[PDB]
Amino acid sequence: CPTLIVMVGLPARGKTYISKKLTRYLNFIGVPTREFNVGQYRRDMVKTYKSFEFFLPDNEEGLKIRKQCALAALNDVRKFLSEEGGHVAVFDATNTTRERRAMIFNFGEQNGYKTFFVESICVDPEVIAANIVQVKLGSPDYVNRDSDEATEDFMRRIECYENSYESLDEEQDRDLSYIKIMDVGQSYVVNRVADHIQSRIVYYLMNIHVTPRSIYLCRAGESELNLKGRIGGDPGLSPRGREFSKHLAQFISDQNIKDLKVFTSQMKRTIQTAEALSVPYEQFKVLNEIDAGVCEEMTYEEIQDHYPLEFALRDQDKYRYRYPKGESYEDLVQRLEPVIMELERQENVLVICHQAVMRCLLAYFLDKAAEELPYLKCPLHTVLKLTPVAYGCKVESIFLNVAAVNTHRDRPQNVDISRPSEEALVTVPAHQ
């Protein structure tokens, strides 16, 4: 049974924000998910600016168009889940009345889906008025609109909804599976989680927040095997590596951060790097570098020479193919699900890790496709600072002023199985 997640809530309550986060997360863990924004359907259709009058519960051309757009989107939900093999569809609309929700529920019922509701009720001033100055900012609806008039219009638009707004009821909606999220995550009300996927969605939703904070990601300092062009293993830091540790520690202080939690893997290179900090760290084996299996501690020349076909295949699909007894980047992603969860839940946090692991975490916060993830640039002695914002995440690359080797191998233009060794290793960075 595919799942139909139905957003419920007044405009500017974070329904879309939640819809995007949930959709991105689900896709990241490999569940084909797609969001359907009814407002976008409405914009892409009328093409002409509309005032709040169009949202009035008595307007004809308005109620007509809005219901048609809801049906258009629902038709695409049907196609995605029933025809394209999608697993979860997120239907982003106010859906503030029991009749509309009953309508949508029956739709799901008839098409063989399981419906689950997600209501967002924001009440805190620094959220409502806070989302407006983002609606008023990035919304196509208020482009080239006088500030005071746009702000006023939107307020009357929310009013068009408050008047008939029927929030999910403990008794009247006992039989529905849903979650009510208050004040962007302070409290929650959960009812009738029907299955495994819903239990995971709930778990995720109850762990995200919008508290300002930053996520710092960096690899351990250059190690002995980084110098030799060797992958995997458990080397200690190189001299220049220890030098970086000292630089990270300074950077961290200069940053002046409220309650920084530091995490490292169980590999010496990260722990050693962490020892330079003042703050105590927490080591987790789940953060360990991607296992190369049989190709552990080898160089690329050695892999090509010993495992020539697997090297070519990995080059063809670096996301899905693994070395013998090793992991794929796909595997790594499954392994890091608990890290993604904790990072969502954390506030200010520094993660000292490795190249593959760091690519995965960066792909998550910057929403990079699986195919592009195994190739993201995560240089040594460089600190990636991630600051979550509305719909996105700002990234700042901060080189900590200490040279280091290039462990980054681009994909060669020739990824053929029959290719010669020269072309296979032409992108291999200089080492030793």
Added chain:
Amino acid sequence: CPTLIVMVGLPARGKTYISKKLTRYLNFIGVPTREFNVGQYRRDMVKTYKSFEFFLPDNEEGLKIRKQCALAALNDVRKFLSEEGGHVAVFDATNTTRERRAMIFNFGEQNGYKTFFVESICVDPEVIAANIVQVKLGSPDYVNRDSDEATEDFMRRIECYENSYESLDEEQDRDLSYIKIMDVGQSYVVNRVADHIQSRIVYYLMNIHVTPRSIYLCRAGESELNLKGRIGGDPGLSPRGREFSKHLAQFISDQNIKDLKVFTSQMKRTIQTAEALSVPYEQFKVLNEIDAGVCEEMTYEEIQDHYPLEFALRDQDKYRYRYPKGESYEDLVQRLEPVIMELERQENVLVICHQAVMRCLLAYFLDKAAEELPYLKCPLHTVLKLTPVAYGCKVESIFLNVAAVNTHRDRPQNVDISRPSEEALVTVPAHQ
């Protein structure tokens, strides 16, 4: 910061049941946890039978003894978290008033703990009458007590609480971190989860239930390597394993179970065993047998001969010591946490797995210590039926009438490092 879980609710609301499941779960995942039942403190202090009068709001003698039992328990909570190195303490008492909960909360505050409340609510009388028949049955309080009088007395005891009962309020208790469980876990209210452990506790509590059902555990049938006395690998079924598959299918039918979900690992022996039932199934790599690393596909004789230091060590701490590039039973336990979660969430379920995995799962439901876990007996072609009950889990061993080899190796009396090889392999079951 150790955590202080404070149970809240009227008598016969499942506070204790929840306290024991939560305590067992937390310990299983390696978080030193201890529950403190205030009623047991009361029973041990007084020794003599007490009518409802003893619990009266005005009974001066009883108000005092109950106050001495509450503080006694709290002093032990303090000793455990602050002196014994415990991580989580579950304070099991009614704690039905705002003023009481604030006293407890201050205690936690002063001792450097984080307080989290778990309220269990039940306003359904058949459920209460059903529960009482467990209180009236297993409670030391109503031993040798006339049924109608016991039942009556307990009802008046609940009233001693209902009258002053102030449930956790959305507004009044806005600053408290808590979870309210309603309709025996149908709905929930969660407020201010403060950290990672609370987030995991919430996740766990929202996924357990008391819907009657059974958990069936059995290994895959005898395999080619079982015959050879070889551990690990990915062998197929032996002629007997196939025969068992045919026996398990029959047993499953004879059982006449409602909606049986079947799970297997990604190893052929389990899948092949599953292929013989009348119902479909799902496979999971998380269920794969414990990784022996370098000692994969080896025999015990071979392990003693090639890695003597490790066979002796693993023999010393079979829970914590691992083979090189392999897992420890401790690691397996961590790996199976998502399996524990799902099994709790499931109703009627059959898991076709392996020896080490089945030991871990059996240790969870039967609450066997980590030190005893790596040694539980899980014979081939033998089905272990687990039926969860109040505070425990009933276990029925069902041999499916098909002979098989012994893969069970008792801990040899000599586990001394540098021990003679004949003593090291004396408990090795005959094979080939």
